[PDB]
């Protein structure tokens, strides 16, 4: 963790982040065995045993029903239409009656088997075989003569619990039409999870760092039904595939840069904010809030939804006091004042009228801040505060620095027609 | 499902998808009888049954406590905002004790009653007795002398089957201020939702499109607390009603169109994105990425989001490089390599720097593609990669089409300022 | 033009050591995992060690497990390989490779650019 | 040890095909099968990576295919200007990467 205030547009720069960015997808199909239940039937009135085997009767046959500029937005449009499409265009395959046998076949003895699909793409397969063992050892022998209410209840009630993986399955996928948001622990156990991840084709050191972080592979992907299948339902999940890892990654961040130039005031704010990684020979940019995330060191984002941006494009960070690179901007009379939290120094503004302060648990008001942009590092203060506001600056530990240089709405004369204007380049601006 | 990639403005209309648009509300108002547990003790310690009845009982006071331009934003805001009133005012009905005693006395022999309310909108009520029908005979029959931990376990885990219903309705109403934002399984029954449907005032082939759809009928529709009377609990669930049905639709969807007409590039992109349908004697634009989903060949829609936009504003479609309409676009020197995945193809912007490729699983790269914006169907390739990432394309079959025209970008300059716009009228910017 | 452009080569004695250096130009260093690939004369390629882009990882063929250790500096932009307790079976050509991995079937990793290499004598 | 024929040959335009045979820690295992081509003292070039892609500059008449265990790669309209190591390579599970035994193509 590493981190820059560029003084000339009231901006920091946050670097030396590891990264983990989800390249491609590996599916993992689970056959999970209810059993026919369809023509189970009890012949004994309503019973704990009966009410549980037609709440197990009513989800498979509801399961059987249901089937599958402002950079931000584009990239969080795609960013899903690319992965549920990634997921259907297997889903394609499995479902053919040919990929169905082949996949039950090979999980005939074994609970994990490896197959390749008729469409080419490679598949882990895994059997969630529990329910039908429990259903055919374990509970047809004990129901006799198709009576239900039978008084050896630990039968009803650890059947109460054998179901529940396959109920929260057909509540996840009915809720979803078919394409849950996140596999949870139902879809794919963190047994299972564990397993997805040793077995998958990817580097022992990706795999403890997946082993670590189980729960950023959870969170990235997500589960497809397939349907019922002669009384099982088949369902894929998709765990992400991190194929470029610990490349350089940076969050760009910014607050209001105003002065009072002409007494009335100008304004610019950098609209380019967020994650930048370098991306195996080019920068891509994440602007969509939903990609990146960060655990410890690392950003976890996802190279679907990054826009890829020219390497020039960091020169908005040295020079957008100079540089001849389209900076994305907006500007206008609109003096806001604000903190941004960039984690090694909240960023303020600090404007007329709006009184501001930084402290800390101890010493009170260390100081009455200045008007204009200021950062205040994590050593600095512990709270600054913004009109009568308290902000809890971060505490961890890391290098800052500044870059001086006066700041852009102070260096030049604003346009004075229109003034005013939405994610504009910078020399439309000034 | 057909396509017609318009070169003219690297933008796609996906026609012939058919429509299901809400255009009413039917209410179900379901009188769940949880019956008088407020006064109801347990003499015999920490046990079963009794903490399974201070649950019910700390429920039912837990729920007595709570009582209820960029087209999106603006349409995301009256949907929400009418949905909730248009429930509203029949809570502020039926929540009278004229209407509470009308409701419950045409239930009282019968589990489902049509009724006509004072402030004379209809509704069907029905009756959940379940939980009063085994707390007033099962159970009651079995808690002498106000015991509770009575072996007869079957009773106290039955018991703990029943309330899941009740207790999931508490949880659901808490959480969301008395208005859900989608039906539970425990607010309406998959049956109760088909009984709905089969009651509601609408045509036999839309009771069975909604009992083919269910999940529409359930995620659109959504419920509303009325509170308990006297240890009943009155709540009331509404059901889209879809009165236009299988009109027109199509989805309009659009990538930069830049060019390099100076080496400086301009680009432009349409803002019009998204779903339109043709109700009855107007076209009608749902920019709202939250209301409009697709099922097969349908769309399902809200119709009070729509912003009703004049027929001619198809002519962007035919030619917005001579349409009169104000077109709204966004322009300015950005270029962006994207892909849009369309239904029956991807569209594939490729610019500077950026090398982009289309494949299939069999024979890899099939073709570099050039420099512009290319409409890639789902037979010409299975994947398609812009840098290092990789894409997957839909494999749905359709009739494609290419509307020839030099693009907007390439066919008009560049106004010299403000050369950068957000969301304005071609006149405008080009 | 990317060249990856090894030098600290020649003879060794057994037992001694010595350093190569994959001096990097014209790409942008820090971006690419590297890999050190070995060629006994006549012989097959072998695949000797392996660093992560910030030297978060790193792997070494059993060969070298041990023995020798690659390492980076992304200031400036070198690649370096101790070679601690040179055998005469290691002599070989080593080459590095800039490696590029499509992480969309696997990870399995290409080498897209190869140096020149050294003839490590021992 | 992933594994190839040791030499191959054929005449001027004709077909000549190079399997590399695979284990299940390497080829089975999923990681895909990547080609290079070294003429003698010089360095390798890449020809073919995934199992089948190939980069800007190839002759465009060189391809892969990957087997669930095997590989292959088809040379065709061979030239003497072909004649040449061909290695391909992947990644073992356990051994990291693994280089082919290197079948030299003759003409």
């Known amino acids: 963790l590493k981190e820059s205030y560029l003084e000339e547009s009231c901006s920091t720069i946050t670097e030396g982040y590891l990264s983990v960015l989800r390249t491609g997808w590996y599916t993992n199909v689970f056959t999970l065995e209810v059993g026919d239940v369809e023509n189970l039937t009890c012949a004994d009135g309503p019973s704990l045993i009966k009410t549980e085997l037609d709440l197990t009767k009513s989800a498979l046959r509801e399961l059987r029903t249901v089937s599958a500029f402002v950079l931000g937005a584009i990239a969080c449009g795609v960013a899903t239409a690319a992965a549920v499409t990634a997921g259907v265009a297997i889903a394609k395959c499995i479902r053919l009656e040919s990929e169905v046998t082949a996949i039950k076949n090979c999980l005939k003895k074994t609970n994990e088997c490896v197959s390749t699909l008729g469409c080419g793409v490679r598949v882990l397969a895994t059997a969630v075989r529990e329910l039908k063992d429990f259903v055919s050892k374990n509970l047809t022998r004990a129901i006799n003569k198709n009576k239900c209410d039978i008084p050896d209840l630990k039968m009803a009630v650890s059947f109460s619990q054998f179901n529940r993986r396959f109920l929260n399955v057909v509540r996840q996928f009915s809720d979803n039409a078919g394409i849950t948001p996140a596999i949870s622990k139902d879809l794919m156990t963190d047994a299972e999870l564990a397993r997805a991840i040793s077995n998958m084709p990817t580097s022992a050191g990706q795999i403890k760092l997946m082993l670590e972080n189980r729960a950023m592979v959870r969170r990235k992907g997500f589960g497809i039904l397939i349907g019922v299948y002669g009384s099982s339902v088949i369902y894929m999940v998709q765990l992400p595939i991190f194929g470029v890892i610990d490349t350089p990654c940076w969050i760009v961040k910014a607050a209001p840069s105003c002065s009072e130039k002409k007494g009335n005031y100008a304004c610019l704010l950098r609209e380019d904010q967020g994650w930048y990684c370098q991306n195996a020979g080019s920068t891509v940019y994440y602007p969509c809030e939903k990609d990146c995330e960060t655990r410890g060191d690392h950003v976890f984002c996802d190279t679907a939804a990054g826009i890829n941006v020219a390497e020039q494009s960091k020169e908005c960070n040295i020079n957008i006091s100079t540089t001849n690179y389209p900076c994305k901007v907006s500007c206008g009379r609109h003096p806001i004042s604000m903190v941004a939290l960039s984690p090694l120094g909240a960023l303020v503004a600090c404007y007329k009228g709006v009184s501001c302060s930084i402290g800390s648990n101890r010493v009170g008001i260390i100081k009455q801040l200045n008007k204009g942009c200021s950062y205040i590092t994590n050593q600095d203060a512990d709270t600054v505060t913004i009109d009568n506001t308290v902000y809890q600056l971060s505490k961890v530990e890391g290098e800052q620095h500044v870059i001086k240089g006066r700041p852009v709405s102070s260096s030049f004369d604003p346009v004075k027609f229109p003034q005013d204007q939405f994610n504009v380049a910078l020399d439309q601006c000034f | 499902l057909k396509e017609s990639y318009l070169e003219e403005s690297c933008s796609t209309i996906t026609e012939g998808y058919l429509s299901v648009l809400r255009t009413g509300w039917y209410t179900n108002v379901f009188t769940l009888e949880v019956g008088d547990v407020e006064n109801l003790t347990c003499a015999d310690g920490p046990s079963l049954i009794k903490t399974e009845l201070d649950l019910t009982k700390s429920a039912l006071r837990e729920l007595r406590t709570v009582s209820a331009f960029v087209l999106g934003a603006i349409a995301c805001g009256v949907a929400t905002a009418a949905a909730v009133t248009a429930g509203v005012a029949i809570a502020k009905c039926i929540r009278l004790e004229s209407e509470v005693t009308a409701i419950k006395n045409c239930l009282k022999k019968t589990n489902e009653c049509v009724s006509t309310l004072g402030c004379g909108v209809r509704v069907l009520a029905t009756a959940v007795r379940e939980l009063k029908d085994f707390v007033s005979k099962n159970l009651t029959r079995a808690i002498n002398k106000n015991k509770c931990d009575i072996p007869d376990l079957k009773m106290a885990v039955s018991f703990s089957q029943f309330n899941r219903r009740f207790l999931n309705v508490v949880r659901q109403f808490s959480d969301n201020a008395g208005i859900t934002p989608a039906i539970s399984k425990d607010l309406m029954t998959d049956a109760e939702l088909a009984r709905a449907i089969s009651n509601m005032p609408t045509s036999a082939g839309q009771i069975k499109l909604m009992l083919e759809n269910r999940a529409m009928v359930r995620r659109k529709g959504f419920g509303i607390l009325i509170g308990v009377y006297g240890s009943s609990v009155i709540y009331m669930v509404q059901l889209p009603i879809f009165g236009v049905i299988d009109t027109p639709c199509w989805i309009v969807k659009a990538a930069p169109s830049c060019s390099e007409k100076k080496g400086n590039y301009a680009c432009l992109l349409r803002e019009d994105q998204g779903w339109y349908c043709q109700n009855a004697g107007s076209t009608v634009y749902y920019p709202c990425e939250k209301d409009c989903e697709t099922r097969g060949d349908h769309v399902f829609c809200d119709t009070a989001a729509g912003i009703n936009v004049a027929e001619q504003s198809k002519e962007c479609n035919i030619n917005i490089s001579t349409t009169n309409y104000p077109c709204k676009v966004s322009c300015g020197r950005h270029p962006i390599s994207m892909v849009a995945l369309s239904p029956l193809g991807a569209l594939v912007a490729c610019y500077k720097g950026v090398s982009c490729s289309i494949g299939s699983n069999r024979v890899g790269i099939i073709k570099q593609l050039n420099k512009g914006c290319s409409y890639i169907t789902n037979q010409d390739a299975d994947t398609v990669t812009i840098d290092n990432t990789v894409y997957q394309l839909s494999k749905v079959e359709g009739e494609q089409h290419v509307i020839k025209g030099r693009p907007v970008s390439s066919s008009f300059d560049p106004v010299k300022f403000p050369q950068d716009q957000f969301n304005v009228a071609l006149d405008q910017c080009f | 033009e990317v060249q990856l452009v090894e030098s600290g080569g020649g003879l060794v004695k057994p037992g001694g050591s010595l350093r190569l250096s994959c001096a990097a130009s014209?790409?942008?260093?820090?971006?690419?995992?590297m890999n050190w690939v070995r060629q006994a004369p006549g012989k097959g390629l072998e695949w000797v060690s392996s660093i992560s882009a910030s030297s978060s990882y790193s792997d070494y063929a059993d060969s070298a497990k041990g023995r020798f250790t690659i390492s980076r500096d992304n200031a400036k932009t070198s690649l370096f390989l101790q070679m601690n307790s040179l055998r005469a079976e290691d002599t070989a050509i080593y080459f590095c490779?800039?490696?590029?991995?499509?992480?969309?079937?696997?990870?399995?990793?290409?080498?897209?650019?190869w140096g020149q290499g050294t003839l490590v004598t021992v | 040890v992933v594994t190839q024929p040791p030499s191959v040959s054929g005449a001027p335009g004709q077909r000549v095909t190079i399997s590399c045979t695979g284990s299940?820690?390497?080829?089975?295992?999923?990681?895909?099968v990547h080609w290079y081509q070294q003429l003698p003292g010089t360095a390798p070039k890449l020809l073919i990576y995934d199992n089948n892609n190939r980069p800007s500059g190839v002759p465009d008449r060189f391809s892969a295919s990957k087997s669930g265990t095997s590989a292959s790669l088809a040379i065709t309209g061979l030239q003497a200007e072909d004649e040449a190591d061909y290695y391909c390579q992947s990644y073992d599970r356990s051994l990291s990467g693994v280089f082919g035994t290197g079948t030299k193509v003759t003409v």
């Open positions: 490779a800039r490696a590029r991995a499509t992480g969309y079937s696997s990870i399995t990793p290409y080498f897209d650019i």
């Open positions: 299940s820690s390497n080829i089975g295992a999923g990681y895909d």
């Open positions: 014209g790409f942008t260093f820090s971006s690419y995992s």
